[PDB]
């Protein structure tokens, strides 16, 4: 009962953590796409 | 109580899990950019 609601809140915090992890993975993919873009631009300039 | 005790552990570990997962994901993400740069360099 009460322990169920507490575990639900803890799982909500863990789900926020997992959503943050997924958003950070997407952001890392976008950042390394930008890194590939700047590397390609600098390599073309070189 | 059980409710008071149980919720604390997962909530506390959530931030550490998010930070570790973000760092790891960036770790293999930078690998793709480095590989593309290596192919361009070759």
């Amino acid at each position: 009962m009460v322990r169920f609601i507490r575990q639900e809140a803890e799982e909500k915090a863990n789900e926020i953590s997992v959503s943050a992890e997924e958003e950070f993975n997407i952001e890392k993919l976008q950042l390394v796409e930008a890194e590939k873009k700047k590397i390609r631009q600098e390599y073309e300039r070189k | 109580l059980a409710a008071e005790q149980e919720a604390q552990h997962i909530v506390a570990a959530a931030r550490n899990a998010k930070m570790a997962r973000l760092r790891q994901a960036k770790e293999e993400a930078e690998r793709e950019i480095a590989e593309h740069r290596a192919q361009v360099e070759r």
Binding site: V2, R6, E8, E10 | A2, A7
Partner: peptide
């Protein structure tokens, strides 16, 4: 303060709170 122990027992029996 007197009923803290009884409240702890009741929370243990009945059961982010």
């Amino acid at each position: 303060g007197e009923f803290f122990s009884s409240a702890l027992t009741s929370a243990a029996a009945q059961q982010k709170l």
